[PDB]
């Protein structure tokens, strides 16, 4: 009943039609935030596209599904996954989008060790994206290695906007408890009104992922890790000797508890650590199809 009501609303917003008419050989590759991701073959071209499938009945907050359409209609960018078309297919929202065939940053972080040319390239790419989103008041709210995707030639793109929200003069802060526990900003876990600064902290946790292979407290149940994040000093790297003073100085601007003192994305683009970033080619050897 409110499901039927919701299918009808989504219908007025999405493209008409059914992309099964032009797509073949759907193969599941992933499950993430809000549903599954398949690759599919575009019949007329032989090209490959990704299809995000999101069951309306399985969302904590169905209304966040509109985020997939807002972000597509409005915030395209070099470092953001491009979204082609959305559809309602029975009880699911489908988004046909760019296939990032290099896979997710998670698979690199859990299986090899990045150097700082590589970390700087990822950080620079992510920060360019955030600088542009944050200037327009868009907060991603689920920054983590699982949300950073790569092309085969090593270009880095932000993905998975399903949890994002907007701030503006009339709604200067968000309040919702949203993200993935281990990456959540402290002010967000403490239920304070928050803004784009939350993505900056989450990026810091992603830097810890890149250096250590895991975010802090990863061995704790989620609820206990949030409590630890709320109450404790900023989390530390397992091994500080494994980062340069430059990388350490960079991280220290990210993992600041007071969001007013945390660096913005605009400021971070100017940080000397980013001078280390290699081109996309430098990221390539890290991917599963290339490492030994």
């Amino acid at each position: 009943v409110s499901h039927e009501q919701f299918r009808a609303a989504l219908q007025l917003v999405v493209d008409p039609g059914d992309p099964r008419s032009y797509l073949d050989n759907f193969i599941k590759i992933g499950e993430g935030s809000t549903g599954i991701v398949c690759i599919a073959t575009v019949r007329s071209s032989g090209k490959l596209v990704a299809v995000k499938k999101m069951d309306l009945r399985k969302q904590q907050r169905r209304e966040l599904l509109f985020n997939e359409v807002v972000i597509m209609r409005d915030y395209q960018h070099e470092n953001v996954v491009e979204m082609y078309n959305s559809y309602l297919v029975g009880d699911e929202l489908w988004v046909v989008m760019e296939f990032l065939e290099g896979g997710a940053l998670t698979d690199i972080v859990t299986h090899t060790r990045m150097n700082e040319e590589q970390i700087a390239a990822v950080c620079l790419a992510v920060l360019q994206a955030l600088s542009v989103l944050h200037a327009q008041g868009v907060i991603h709210r689920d920054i983590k290695s699982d949300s950073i995707l790569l092309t085969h030639d090593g270009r880095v793109k932000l993905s998975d906007f399903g949890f994002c929200a907007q701030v503006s003069k009339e709604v200067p802060r968000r309040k919702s408890l949203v993200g993935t526990p281990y990456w959540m900003a402290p002010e967000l876990i403490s239920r304070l009104p928050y803004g784009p600064e939350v993505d900056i902290w989450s990026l810091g946790i992603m830097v810890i992922e890149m250096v250590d292979g895991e975010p802090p407290y990863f061995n704790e149940p989620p609820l206990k890790a949030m409590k630890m994040i709320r109450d404790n000093l900023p989390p530390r790297l397992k091994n500080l000797h494994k980062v340069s003073p430059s990388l350490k100085g960079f991280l220290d601007r990210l993992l600041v508890r007071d969001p007013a003192q945390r660096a913005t994305a605009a400021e971070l683009l100017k940080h000397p650590f980013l001078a280390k970033a290699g081109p996309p080619a430098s990221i390539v050897p890290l991917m599963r199809q290339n490492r030994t």
Binding site: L64, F163, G179, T180, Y182, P222
Partner: peptide, 6 residues
Amino acid sequence: RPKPLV
């Protein structure tokens, strides 16, 4: 992987 909390 840990799931998002909404």
